[PDB]
Structures are given as C-alpha cells and as structure tokens.
Amino acid sequence: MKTRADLFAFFDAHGVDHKTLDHPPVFRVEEGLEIKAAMPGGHTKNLFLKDAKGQLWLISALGETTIDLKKLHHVIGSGRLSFGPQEMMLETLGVTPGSVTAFGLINDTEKRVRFVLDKALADSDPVNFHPLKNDATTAVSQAGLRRFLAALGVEPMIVDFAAMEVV
Numbered sequence: 641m642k643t644r645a646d647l648f649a650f651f652d653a654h655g656v657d658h659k660t661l662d663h664p665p666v667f668r669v670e671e672g673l674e675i676k677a678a679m680p681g682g683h684t685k686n687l688f689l690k691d692a693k694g695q696l697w698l699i700s701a702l703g704e705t706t707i708d709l710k711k712l713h714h715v716i717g718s719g720r721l722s723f724g725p726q727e728m729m730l731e732t733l734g735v736t737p738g739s740v741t742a743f744g745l746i747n748d749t750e751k752r753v754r755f756v757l758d759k760a761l762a763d764s765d766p767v768n769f770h771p772l773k774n775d776a777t778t779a780v781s782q783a784g785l786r787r788f789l790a791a792l793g794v795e796p797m798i799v800d801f802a803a804m805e806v807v
C-alpha cells in the first residue's frame with residue numbers, strides 16, 4: 641500500500657507536477673471555502689462503487705455534479721450500482737474512509753477498478769484531489785491528471801452526467 645511519498649515519487653518519474661496544501665480534515669464549511677480560495681480549479685468528489693456483477697468503479701467528478709446512481713448503469717454499461725465496500729476501497733485504492741481520490745489508482749495493481757471522469761472535471765484546470773489522505777489537497781493540471789492516468793494505463797470513460805452520455 642502506497643504512501644504519499646510513493647505517490648509523489650510516481651508523479652516525479654512521470655512529470656506530473658503538483659502543489660499540496662496540508663490541512664486538518666474538513667468538517668466546517670468555512671474551512672472548505674478557505675481551501676477553495678487558495679486552490680483554484682476543480683474541486684472533486686470521488687465515488688467508489690461496486691456494480692451488481694462485481695465490477696468496481698471509481699467516479700471522479702466536480703463536487704457539485706449530480707450523479708444519478710439509479711440510472712447511471714445504463715450510461716456506462718455496468719450492472720446496477722451500489723457504493724463499494726470499505727475493505728475493497730482499502731485493498732484497491734489504498735485509502736481510508738473519507739479519503740477517496742483518483743490518485744489512489746496507483747494502488748490498483750490487479751486493475752480491478754474502471755475509472756469514470758465527469759466531463760465537467762475533464763474541462764476543469766487545474767484539478768484537486770487528496771494525496772491518499774484527506775488531511776491535504778493536491779493540485780495538478782488537467783494535462784497532469786491525464787499524464788498520471790496514462791502512466792498507469794488507465795483509460796478514463798468520460799461521462800456527461802447532465803446528458804447522461806459517454807463522450
């Protein structure tokens with residue numbers, strides 16, 4: 641299971657530049673606003689899902705993007721979707737509760753996790769995610785995110801969640 645230092649070593653090897661802000665885990669709306677004020681670009685949510693057929697899925701989206709989980713399976717070609725179990729979140733993404741992040745894909749050595757990217761987040765620059773724990777927020781450019789995914793061999797499925805279409 642990878643550390644933050646391991647993640648940044650991976651970024652460095654592959655030319656993904658980063659800027660990190662350390663902070664207590666956010667439980668207050670004022671603190672969240674302060675972070676967003678210091679860190680431009682897309683601020684994310686990252687949903688760890690398991691479908692009725694056993695396939696794991698990670699959706700990274702802007703926080704405000706509405707995701708209709710009742711109907712999404714028709715769009716992405718999955719079985720009906722539920723939230724995945726915490727144990728698999730640890731095993732495949734190496735993160736603990738409340739710390740889900742696209743950067744956790746560095747831990748998915750069996751390539752069990754299919755990755756869905758909100759079109760609105762693909763069209764954000766920069767983008768911000770936790771560096772494997774929610775006591776920090778890490779910015780990378782949009783190109784950097786794509787460089788990261790490419791280095792892992794992860795092809796994102798880009799979904800327009802408003803139109804409910806793969807794009």
Ligand SMILES: [Cl-]
Pocket residue numbers: 781783784
């Ligand atoms: Cl870049």
